[PDB]
Design a protein around this nucleic acid. Structure first.
Ligand code: FME
Ligand code: K
Ligand code: MG
Ligand code: MG
Ligand code: MG
Ligand code: MG
Ligand code: MG
Ligand code: MG
Ligand code: MG
Ligand code: MG
Ligand code: MG
Ligand code: MG
Ligand code: MG
Ligand code: MG
Ligand code: MG
Ligand code: MG
Ligand code: MG
Ligand code: MG
Ligand code: MG
Ligand code: MG
Ligand code: MG
Ligand code: MG
Ligand code: MG
Ligand code: MG
Ligand code: MG
Ligand code: MG
Ligand code: MG
Ligand code: MG
Ligand code: MG
Ligand code: MG
Ligand code: MG
Ligand code: MG
Ligand code: MG
Ligand code: MG
Ligand code: MG
Ligand code: MG
Ligand code: MG
Ligand code: MG
Ligand code: MG
Ligand code: MG
Ligand code: MG
Ligand code: MG
Ligand code: MG
Ligand code: MG
Ligand code: MG
Ligand code: MG
Ligand code: MG
Ligand code: MG
Ligand code: MG
Ligand code: MG
Ligand code: MG
Ligand code: MG
Ligand code: MG
Ligand code: MG
Ligand code: MG
Ligand code: MG
Ligand code: MG
Ligand code: MG
Ligand code: MG
Ligand code: MG
Ligand code: MG
Ligand code: MG
Ligand code: MG
Ligand code: MG
Ligand code: MG
Ligand code: MG
Ligand code: MG
Ligand code: MG
Ligand code: MG
Ligand code: MG
Ligand code: MG
Ligand code: MG
Ligand code: MG
Ligand code: MG
Ligand code: MG
Ligand code: MG
Ligand code: MG
Ligand code: MG
Ligand code: MG
Ligand code: MG
Ligand code: MG
Ligand code: MG
Ligand code: MG
Ligand code: MG
Ligand code: MG
Ligand code: MG
Ligand code: MG
Ligand code: MG
Ligand code: MG
Ligand code: MG
Ligand code: MG
Ligand code: MG
Ligand code: MG
Ligand code: MG
Ligand code: MG
Ligand code: MG
Ligand code: MG
Ligand code: MG
Ligand code: MG
Ligand code: MG
Ligand code: MG
Ligand code: MG
Ligand code: MG
Ligand code: MG
Ligand code: MG
Ligand code: MG
Ligand code: MG
Ligand code: MG
Ligand code: MG
Ligand code: MG
Ligand code: MG
Ligand code: MG
Ligand code: MG
Ligand code: MG
Ligand code: MG
Ligand code: MG
Ligand code: MG
Ligand code: MG
Ligand code: MG
Ligand code: MG
Ligand code: MG
Ligand code: MG
Ligand code: MG
Ligand code: MG
Ligand code: MG
Ligand code: MG
Ligand code: MG
Ligand code: MG
Ligand code: MG
Ligand code: MG
Ligand code: MG
Ligand code: MG
Ligand code: MG
Ligand code: MG
Ligand code: MG
Ligand code: MG
Ligand code: MG
Ligand code: MG
Ligand code: MG
Ligand code: MG
Ligand code: MG
Ligand code: MG
Ligand code: MG
Ligand code: MG
Ligand code: MG
Ligand code: MG
Ligand code: MG
Ligand code: MG
Ligand code: MG
Ligand code: MG
Ligand code: MG
Ligand code: MG
Ligand code: MG
Ligand code: MG
Ligand code: MG
Ligand code: MG
Ligand code: MG
Ligand code: MG
Ligand code: MG
Ligand code: MG
Ligand code: MG
Ligand code: MG
Ligand code: MG
Ligand code: MG
Ligand code: MG
Ligand code: MG
Ligand code: MG
Ligand code: MG
Ligand code: MG
Ligand code: MG
Ligand code: MG
Ligand code: MG
Ligand code: MG
Ligand code: MG
Ligand code: MG
Ligand code: MG
Ligand code: MG
Ligand code: MG
Ligand code: MG
Ligand code: MG
Ligand code: MG
Ligand code: MG
Ligand code: MG
Ligand code: MG
Ligand code: MG
Ligand code: MG
Ligand code: MG
Ligand code: MG
Ligand code: MG
Ligand code: MG
Ligand code: MG
Ligand code: MG
Ligand code: MG
Ligand code: MG
Ligand code: MG
Ligand code: MG
Ligand code: MG
Ligand code: MG
Ligand code: MG
Ligand code: MG
Ligand code: MG
Ligand code: MG
Ligand code: MG
Ligand code: MG
Ligand code: MG
Ligand code: MG
Ligand code: MG
Ligand code: MG
Ligand code: MG
Ligand code: MG
Ligand code: MG
Ligand code: MG
Ligand code: MG
Lengths: 64, 71, 51, 75
RNA sequence: CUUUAAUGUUUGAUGUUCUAACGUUGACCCGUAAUCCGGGUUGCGGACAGUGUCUGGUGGGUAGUUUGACUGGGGCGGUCUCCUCCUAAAGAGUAACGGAGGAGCACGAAGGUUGGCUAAUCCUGGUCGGACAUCAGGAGGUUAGUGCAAUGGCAUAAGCCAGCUUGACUGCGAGCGUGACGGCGCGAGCAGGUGCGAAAGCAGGUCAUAGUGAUCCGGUGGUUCUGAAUGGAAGGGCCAUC
RNA sequence: UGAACUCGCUGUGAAGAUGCAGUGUACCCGCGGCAAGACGGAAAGACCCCGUGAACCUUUACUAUAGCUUGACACUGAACA
RNA sequence: GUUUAUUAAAAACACAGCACUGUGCAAACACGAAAGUGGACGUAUACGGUGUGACGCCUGCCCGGUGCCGGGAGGUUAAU
RNA sequence: UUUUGUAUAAUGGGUCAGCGACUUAUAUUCUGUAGCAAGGUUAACCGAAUAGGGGAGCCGAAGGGAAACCGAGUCUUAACU
RNA sequence: CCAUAGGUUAAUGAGGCGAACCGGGGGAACUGAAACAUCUAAGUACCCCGAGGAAAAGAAAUCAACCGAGAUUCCCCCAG
């Protein structure tokens, strides 16, 4: 039988052109007033997954 | 249900007519794809009149430089 | 505890707002700061309001 | 025991030492108070972090009435 | 509108009687040689009781489970995240149930900026007034102060004082530090729009370092985004936020 | 019952040696006795700890639940006050 | 008298007697999806449960807590 | 064998003979190797047939964006050195 | 009161067994979630009823997307 994708991971990562994955930053859901604007601005755009935790992502979603 | 038609695989249908049902017979895009777009992937020779299809600004220069008139 | 948090809403423009903390017991009146609305792209009287 | 507590360490110190070529924006000294002070082409942020404001080589100087350490950059 | 009388009009808590559902482990009769069961007469209950669905309460009667780690064996006690100093061997880092302390905030002025200022503690003289309140001069010079621990720092004052104010601004961000990662932090300059100053300038909160929690789920406002035939909508998304 | 050509002592040594070092002593082999040692044999310690193991048992631990108990609708009908 | 057949025979269990308690007969209660059985072909001098444990002298104060029992005005309160 | 460490007086084995433990199926990424190449390639099936059809598909040659949408650009943003 | 329940006799089938496969009625737990209660294992094991040579399903109150498919079933894709 075929491999099943870890769907939760499929809803948190997207495959870029090279091979790496874009993901949304943590710490931008609630408790925002105490955080500085500079943080919240820097956390807004998407970000690339680090080379340490890339193998864990590549395993859990083998399709795309 | 939208495709990205390569302009390299443009003149492989029916002379110079590429509506949708004609393009579908050439096996370039899937069956359940109503909307589709011609991007600048390089290389056209023959004149192709691209009817009923969305075309890119780079491909609009190329297709017309080859000869064919869009819409 | 004690110090609650408030929603500074604009007057002239869209319902864009800021959020600050406020001590309600010591200062029972309302704020009326002049902060920047980025939808209208101009400084506007931002009035205090509840969440 | 009554105690058995400590904070995480802050990694404070001279990151770029004297003579080292640094790029415009490079942090030279992370510290608490102005032990070192900002000289020529060197800034001083809210955290008292001295950083390069120009591409050049770091220079440590000891000048002033109170004999303080200053950090300059010369291209 | 209040406040209330007679009649029509619309329903309800109660009950009390009724018999026809229902009950009958009252009595008899028949299938019938039978204390079963059915049927039939007949009394006594009688629309209650009982039984079905829904529903609140109760429920170790019964079932499935949970009941943390560190630990100079385990238990009891103590600790678990964040900040400061030493341990830490002159960069960074560095343990122990090693040695000492703090934090889970505070503030529309305690922020901004402009313009000023200088402290402690004594000495001597002076009404009530005395060691000490307020005044004068002299002495010392940062022992002071810094919204809170400790550290490093500050007279160019970051100290204490006033005058206007809202930069505790939106979009970014060259280039660095620090983390296994999640993350965290420092940041000149650009666009837009303010404040303060006569202008150079300074301003993306507070002298810095604690004041804090991921995801999921859901709420609240916004929105050139999506909308299961089409038009809307719901519901999602994106932005702000709880 | 790993194989044995299967001594004492003092030391050493995964920390109590038939087996290592140094030393001492001892012809080869039965038979009857004794049980100090072979950390002798017998049971993957039952004490203690550990496992995000098991089982039963307790309870005002969490969750349910049979049973018991309350109303609504149903089987369920006519008067009048 | 009974008890751990196979390491415990006892002070343990039972016991006659004693109290509280439920039960009005289609009894309480028990076994049982139910029909139905037992209780009992018994009917409160009976039956079930709980404790205590021949016999003699006795058995004191507390109803705040947990349970039980009664009361129904008031508050809160599900389905509908 | 397990260990920081075993002649260890820690584990296991009386001996011999036989048997006894990284497998199989489909998906997937990477390395080698062979085919053909901006192409490669078929699946069930139809063939009696390891031929040959059948390209339904799949994958690649284009990505950015949450998405509409635009596309050698595009996203961000009022606009980006 | 007729009648019904009954009770005889007679025709006519049924009864039981059997490896798997099929449809229905009931229906676990270990296990996984590195604990565990939603969830998983799984309508799986098992129990029961009716089958037949197959059984079930079946000729649209189907699903498409302004074009159109024209019953069910089974296999390969769409698509982890
Ligand atoms: C169950 S109590 C057992 C006593 C314990 N064990 C000895 O082997 C001693 O010490
Ligand atoms: K009431
Ligand atoms: Mg959000
Ligand atoms: Mg911050
Ligand atoms: Mg800010
Ligand atoms: Mg802030
Ligand atoms: Mg795929
Ligand atoms: Mg195709
Ligand atoms: Mg394709
Ligand atoms: Mg190309
Ligand atoms: Mg102690
Ligand atoms: Mg430290
Ligand atoms: Mg340390
Ligand atoms: Mg070099
Ligand atoms: Mg700064
Ligand atoms: Mg009747
Ligand atoms: Mg009767
Ligand atoms: Mg009757
Ligand atoms: Mg009866
Ligand atoms: Mg008779
Ligand atoms: Mg009878
Ligand atoms: Mg009868
Ligand atoms: Mg009832
Ligand atoms: Mg209920
Ligand atoms: Mg309940
Ligand atoms: Mg309950
Ligand atoms: Mg229990
Ligand atoms: Mg239990
Ligand atoms: Mg436990
Ligand atoms: Mg423990
Ligand atoms: Mg201990
Ligand atoms: Mg120890
Ligand atoms: Mg010890
Ligand atoms: Mg403890
Ligand atoms: Mg820690
Ligand atoms: Mg020191
Ligand atoms: Mg040190
Ligand atoms: Mg050091
Ligand atoms: Mg050193
Ligand atoms: Mg490190
Ligand atoms: Mg260490
Ligand atoms: Mg330590
Ligand atoms: Mg404390
Ligand atoms: Mg003001
Ligand atoms: Mg002030
Ligand atoms: Mg100020
Ligand atoms: Mg002035
Ligand atoms: Mg000043
Ligand atoms: Mg001081
Ligand atoms: Mg100090
Ligand atoms: Mg002041
Ligand atoms: Mg003032
Ligand atoms: Mg003015
Ligand atoms: Mg803007
Ligand atoms: Mg940046
Ligand atoms: Mg650049
Ligand atoms: Mg960069
Ligand atoms: Mg690192
Ligand atoms: Mg990072
Ligand atoms: Mg911080
Ligand atoms: Mg900070
Ligand atoms: Mg600047
Ligand atoms: Mg620049
Ligand atoms: Mg400007
Ligand atoms: Mg203007
Ligand atoms: Mg202007
Ligand atoms: Mg103005
Ligand atoms: Mg001016
Ligand atoms: Mg002037
Ligand atoms: Mg002017
Ligand atoms: Mg200016
Ligand atoms: Mg800036
Ligand atoms: Mg500032
Ligand atoms: Mg301050
Ligand atoms: Mg100030
Ligand atoms: Mg804070
Ligand atoms: Mg904290
Ligand atoms: Mg959750
Ligand atoms: Mg959760
Ligand atoms: Mg909603
Ligand atoms: Mg709107
Ligand atoms: Mg709208
Ligand atoms: Mg948009
Ligand atoms: Mg819209
Ligand atoms: Mg639309
Ligand atoms: Mg629609
Ligand atoms: Mg549809
Ligand atoms: Mg619809
Ligand atoms: Mg549909
Ligand atoms: Mg919605
Ligand atoms: Mg939404
Ligand atoms: Mg925005
Ligand atoms: Mg926007
Ligand atoms: Mg021998
Ligand atoms: Mg011998
Ligand atoms: Mg001998
Ligand atoms: Mg010896
Ligand atoms: Mg020794
Ligand atoms: Mg030995
Ligand atoms: Mg020895
Ligand atoms: Mg020797
Ligand atoms: Mg001998
Ligand atoms: Mg001999
Ligand atoms: Mg002899
Ligand atoms: Mg002998
Ligand atoms: Mg003997
Ligand atoms: Mg030996
Ligand atoms: Mg041993
Ligand atoms: Mg032994
Ligand atoms: Mg064992
Ligand atoms: Mg063992
Ligand atoms: Mg024990
Ligand atoms: Mg555990
Ligand atoms: Mg564990
Ligand atoms: Mg357990
Ligand atoms: Mg159990
Ligand atoms: Mg057992
Ligand atoms: Mg139990
Ligand atoms: Mg029961
Ligand atoms: Mg029962
Ligand atoms: Mg109703
Ligand atoms: Mg006996
Ligand atoms: Mg015995
Ligand atoms: Mg025994
Ligand atoms: Mg005896
Ligand atoms: Mg005995
Ligand atoms: Mg007795
Ligand atoms: Mg008596
Ligand atoms: Mg009593
Ligand atoms: Mg009685
Ligand atoms: Mg039962
Ligand atoms: Mg039954
Ligand atoms: Mg009964
Ligand atoms: Mg009976
Ligand atoms: Mg009898
Ligand atoms: Mg007794
Ligand atoms: Mg007595
Ligand atoms: Mg007793
Ligand atoms: Mg006597
Ligand atoms: Mg009394
Ligand atoms: Mg009482
Ligand atoms: Mg009372
Ligand atoms: Mg009552
Ligand atoms: Mg009561
Ligand atoms: Mg009552
Ligand atoms: Mg009542
Ligand atoms: Mg009442
Ligand atoms: Mg109500
Ligand atoms: Mg071992
Ligand atoms: Mg060991
Ligand atoms: Mg050995
Ligand atoms: Mg050795
Ligand atoms: Mg041994
Ligand atoms: Mg042993
Ligand atoms: Mg051994
Ligand atoms: Mg072993
Ligand atoms: Mg062992
Ligand atoms: Mg072994
Ligand atoms: Mg052995
Ligand atoms: Mg062998
Ligand atoms: Mg064999
Ligand atoms: Mg393998
Ligand atoms: Mg490759
Ligand atoms: Mg390769
Ligand atoms: Mg190769
Ligand atoms: Mg090759
Ligand atoms: Mg080639
Ligand atoms: Mg064939
Ligand atoms: Mg042929
Ligand atoms: Mg032939
Ligand atoms: Mg064949
Ligand atoms: Mg494809
Ligand atoms: Mg290319
Ligand atoms: Mg893409
Ligand atoms: Mg794309
Ligand atoms: Mg554009
Ligand atoms: Mg856009
Ligand atoms: Mg745009
Ligand atoms: Mg643009
Ligand atoms: Mg512009
Ligand atoms: Mg532009
Ligand atoms: Mg007759
Ligand atoms: Mg007759
Ligand atoms: Mg007849
Ligand atoms: Mg008959
Ligand atoms: Mg017969
Ligand atoms: Mg016959
Ligand atoms: Mg016959
Ligand atoms: Mg017959
Ligand atoms: Mg016959
Ligand atoms: Mg016949
Ligand atoms: Mg049969
Ligand atoms: Mg079946
Ligand atoms: Mg079956
Ligand atoms: Mg399993
Ligand atoms: Mg489990
Ligand atoms: Mg389970
Ligand atoms: Mg599990
Ligand atoms: Mg597990
Ligand atoms: Mg467990
Ligand atoms: Mg399933
Ligand atoms: Mg079923
Ligand atoms: Mg079944
Ligand atoms: Mg199974
Ligand atoms: Mg037949
Ligand atoms: Mg059939
Ligand atoms: Mg059929
Ligand atoms: Mg049917
Ligand atoms: Mg049919
Ligand atoms: Mg029909
Ligand atoms: Mg559609
Ligand atoms: Mg048809
Ligand atoms: Mg069909």
């Amino acid at each position: 039988p075929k491999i099943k994708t870890v769907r939760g991971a499929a809803k948190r990562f997207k495959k870029t052109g090279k091979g790496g994955f874009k993901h949304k930053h943590a710490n931008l859901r609630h408790i925002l007033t105490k955080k500085a604007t500079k943080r919240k601005r820097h956390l807004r755009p998407k970000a690339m997954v680090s080379k340490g935790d890339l193998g864990l992502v590549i395993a859990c979603l083998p399709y795309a | 249900i939208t495709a990205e038609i390569r302009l390299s695989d443009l003149a492989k249908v029916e002379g110079g007519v590429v509506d949708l049902n004609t393009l579908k017979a050439a096996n370039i895009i899937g069956i359940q794809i109503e909307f589709a777009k011609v991007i600048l992937a390089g290389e056209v020779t023959t004149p192709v009149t691209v009817r009923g299809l969305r075309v890119t600004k780079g491909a609009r220069a190329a297709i017309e430089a080859a000869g064919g008139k869009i819409e | 505890g004690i110090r609650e948090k408030i929603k500074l809403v604009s007057s002239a423009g869209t319902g864009h707002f800021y959020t600050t903390t406020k001590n309600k017991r010591t200062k029972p009146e309302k704020l009326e700061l002049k902060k920047f609305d980025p939808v209208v792209r101009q400084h506007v009287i931002y009035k205090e309001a509840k969440i | 025991t009554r105690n058995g507590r400590d904070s995480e360490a802050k990694r404070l110190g001279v990151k770029r030492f004297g003579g080292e070529s640094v790029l415009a924006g490079s942090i030279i000294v992370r510290q608490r108070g102005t032990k070192f002070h900002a000289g020529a082409n060197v800034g001083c942020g809210r955290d008292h972090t001295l950083f390069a404001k120009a591409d050049g080589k770091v220079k440590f100087e000891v000048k002033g009435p109170k004999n303080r350490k200053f950090i300059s950059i010369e291209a």
